[PDB]
Design a protein around this ligand. Structure first.
Ligand SMILES: *[C@@H]1O[C@H](CO)[C@@H](O)[C@H](O)[C@H]1NC(C)=O
Ligand SMILES: *[C@@H]1O[C@H](CO)[C@@H](O)[C@H](O)[C@H]1NC(C)=O
Ligand SMILES: *[C@@H]1O[C@H](CO)[C@@H](O)[C@H](O)[C@H]1NC(C)=O
Ligand SMILES: *[C@@H]1O[C@H](CO)[C@@H](O)[C@H](O)[C@H]1NC(C)=O
Ligand SMILES: *[C@@H]1O[C@H](CO)[C@@H](O)[C@H](O)[C@H]1NC(C)=O
Ligand SMILES: CN1CCC[C@H]1c1cccnc1
Ligand SMILES: CN1CCC[C@H]1c1cccnc1
Ligand SMILES: CN1CCC[C@H]1c1cccnc1
Ligand SMILES: CN1CCC[C@H]1c1cccnc1
Ligand SMILES: CN1CCC[C@H]1c1cccnc1
Lengths: 206, 206, 206, 206, 212
């Protein structure tokens, strides 16, 4: 307990908080999705509800320490409010995202952070034809709302969404699910913004 | 990180917070809407639900800095709680607005701020006839709740609402969408209040 | 900005906050309602939903200043959390009131405050007969929850509810709407409590 | 204002906050219910919704003062966050309780506190037969969640629930309503725990 | 009041807060469920809603005191925000858990804590066949979201869920309910994570219907 308390005090109580990335100190966030359930479709509003968890990974020099100086501590858990976290946002949500897991991240001695929020999302999706053999395809982009590609870049480790925890008795079966880096431009701003496009093809289970 | 931390400390930790505009130091806020979806209509209550984002821009002398003195930083992202923001309010809402994006603004060295909240709004609108060829027209005014035209003026850069991100598979198609500065008077107060009137004509998609 | 910052610091950062009215220092709050919409009726639960705004006015000696000493500032806007506000409560609500406007008040140099919260209220009301020519009458009392008439008195400037912003395409039309001071007694307490009784007669629009 | 400010500063800013009752310093809380409305019954889930207010009374030596020393102040209103309040909990709720009144208590010079929260509660209740002459009976226990009878005792002043403000046009009429102290054990804990059992018999209004 | 105020000040205002368990100082949390009601089933979304309370118990050396030095105080109630609490999470929830009881724990002089949150949970469960005699079986895992088995272990005192407070007029009757420690692995992480698997068999309360 003593060494960890000392480590946390040194990382968090001495300097001002990390002010986020800049054009001079850009950051790459690795994203990956684990899809748990397509919980419902609303054919009267063209909204669909997903439950998933989103693995986020990034690295900051300001979170580095030498384990020798702190009783061989190589990592620790801490409230996400203690650290900067990326503002990864769904671009076609129709309701605020609901948080289904504790807001706690794991920080490692090399300055790397792992944060894996479980979420329920309602997003824009037309489910007409979901009861057919061909099913339907829907898509939602996830990216920083406020940081361009000059401050936050994104990547995935694989373009295949993890389906190994998908609910076996869901009303919907997944035909395919991919997660792919894209570049986009917006009216507000001349700079490219980066997103990961989650594309899910599904149909009613036989 | 170092120069930005120094800049933020200088802008925010030395003076009291900006106390908002006054008759002596008035402020002009530029508004623009990007309409993403008419998500639903409730013909039993005459309420309609929109998802959009609202670009807000204003300029304060108290947020100016010389980039030379701060490692050539020309802008930065910061929590909207760190700065004053205008109290732009829908005048015919029937529920609290739901926030769909992070509360983070971009501040630029000339003292200009850009803040772009994504919102879901339920407002007063009679959808009778939406299933016809002619469709229906609805309107909602956005403006300061508490500041008259002597403290906050509004403008738009264009009268045309941005429809380039409108959801292509929405239940409703947009026939027209405009955003227009207006002056209004209220029983409480002799002074003019300024709003931007969002006027949307829509119908059920064919 | 400078003079206002100085004024706010002098009013709020020197003394403890105003502790509310007392039997020795009683307060009169002026109330007035502006009815915007009867949004829905639920005939299965006898609940009706109103959207309105409630103009509240009171005066404190502790909020007085001389404009000469503060750059001719005669009024200012400030967060309602900076000041004491009266605990005006609907007596037959069935849900928490939903807040539809920013929590910001206007303070004037004579010590007077104006605070105008927009609200959506569900309250107890039997709508049986609303679809007839005669319509139905409903009523809800607004008053302090915790302060008797010895600490908070209420008045209205007029007994006529302001209907000039009533939604023209509402499902319901207003036949009459009055706001009237009353005295009431409760089992807990021997002292009179004051309320303003909002009485609305309405029917389904032709 | 001056004397009250001084009294509040002396009661609240000098000592640490009251840490709650103990086996050495136990407390008796007096409870009483005022039933306003049975708002709805859900026969598909066996949940019923009540609106009531709950009068709570207790006495602390640490809230005593001599009125002579404080300009003859015999009582005052204060935010419930300034004081300890008992953790009175419904034992068969199905949703979080909704708060319908301001969180403000009245403290009197003898150290007694009166706090009267208005609440909407959904609780477990089978309404089958409510449309008959005999009606149905339902019950819910209210008590401390965490303090045994050695720290918190409860009493009522009467076993009759106050029905004098019951909504006259409710869908349901009340045949009887009682509030009765009970002692229980729970598997977690060896000590007796005290509750007040609210028993309501009702039927659909003729 | 005086001795307790002194005890709380000594436990909470002198050191930094307990930073949670570590591989060097692991912690075992005991869990047990008391099922109060299956409030509803949604056959169109395969979601079911439970109301229960979850007894959590753990022990920290940093919460120990000598009762002799504090007026013979052997335990006290305190806000759960004053102490570290384990991040026990349902693994197949479809909505945020709703809290139905005050967030207050009981701390005892040996450093043991008891915290018993009442909760309403919506979780993934197919109720097809609930209206039959055999009923349906559903399951939900509860465990730390972020701590592996090297930092947080779990146990139960019994594998039988407490059903003695189950609502007698519920729409659903419980046939059986068990709570069992399990080990699981996740894609993110090589380390084992521990959960307690809550398995409930239930059916509609129907006529005065027999269990065969
Ligand atoms: C940490 O690692 C060093 C180097 O191997 C070892 O000698 C020491 O015993 C360890 N210290 C602790 C506190 O585990
Ligand atoms: C700012 O720009 C100048 C060149 O235009 C460069 O020499 C200087 O090093 C820059 N400052 C920093 C901190 O990078
Ligand atoms: C206040 O009003 C007086 C009288 O007109 C004027 O001379 C003075 O300049 C004003 N003060 C400021 C700070 O504008
Ligand atoms: C309090 O009451 C005493 C007794 O009559 C009186 O003499 C004193 O002036 C009072 N003080 C105030 C502030 O009312
Ligand atoms: C504490 O315990 C001792 C031993 O039983 C007893 O004599 C004393 O009165 C107790 N109470 C205190 C210290 O308040
Ligand atoms: C890329 N974002 C999404 C839409 C607007 C844009 C943006 C840019 C800067 C600050 N806020 C929002
Ligand atoms: C312009 N607002 C709209 C209606 C009330 C008015 C207002 C004015 C001052 C303070 N609050 C609200
Ligand atoms: C006037 N209110 C309505 C009924 C209870 C009463 C009251 C009085 C004092 C403190 N809280 C509530
Ligand atoms: C008396 N309560 C009701 C059920 C559990 C119990 C309890 C006791 C101590 C801390 N939390 C809950
Ligand atoms: C065991 N957890 C649940 C799924 C991912 C994993 C995890 C690990 C670290 C931080 N958050 C979540």
């Amino acid at each position: 307990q003593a060494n960890l308390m000392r480590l946390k005090s040194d990382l968090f109580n001495r300097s001002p908080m990390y002010p986020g990335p800049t054009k001079d100190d850009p950051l790459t966030v690795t994203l990956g999705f684990t899809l748990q359930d397509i919980v419902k479709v609303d054919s009267s509003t063209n909204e669909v509800d997903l439950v998933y968890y989103e693995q986020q990974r990034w690295k900051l020099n300001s979170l580095m320490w030498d384990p020798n100086e702190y009783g061989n501590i190589t990592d620790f858990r801490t409230s996400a409010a203690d650290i900067w976290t990326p503002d990864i946002t769904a671009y076609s949500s129709t309701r605020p995202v609901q948080v289904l897991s504790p807001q706690i991240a794991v920080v490692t001695h090399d300055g790397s952070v792992m944060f894996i929020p479980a979420q329920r999302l309602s997003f824009m999706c037309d489910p007409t034809g979901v009861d057919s053999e061909e099913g339907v395809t829907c898509a939602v982009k996830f990216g920083s709302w406020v940081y361009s590609g000059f401050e936050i870049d994104l990547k995935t480790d694989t373009d295949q969404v993890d389906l190994s925890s998908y609910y076996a008795s869901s009303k919907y079966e997944i035909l395919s699910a991919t997660q792919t880096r894209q570049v986009q431009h917006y009216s507000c701003c001349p700079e490219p913004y980066i997103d990961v496009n989650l594309v899910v093809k599904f149909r009613e289970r036989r």
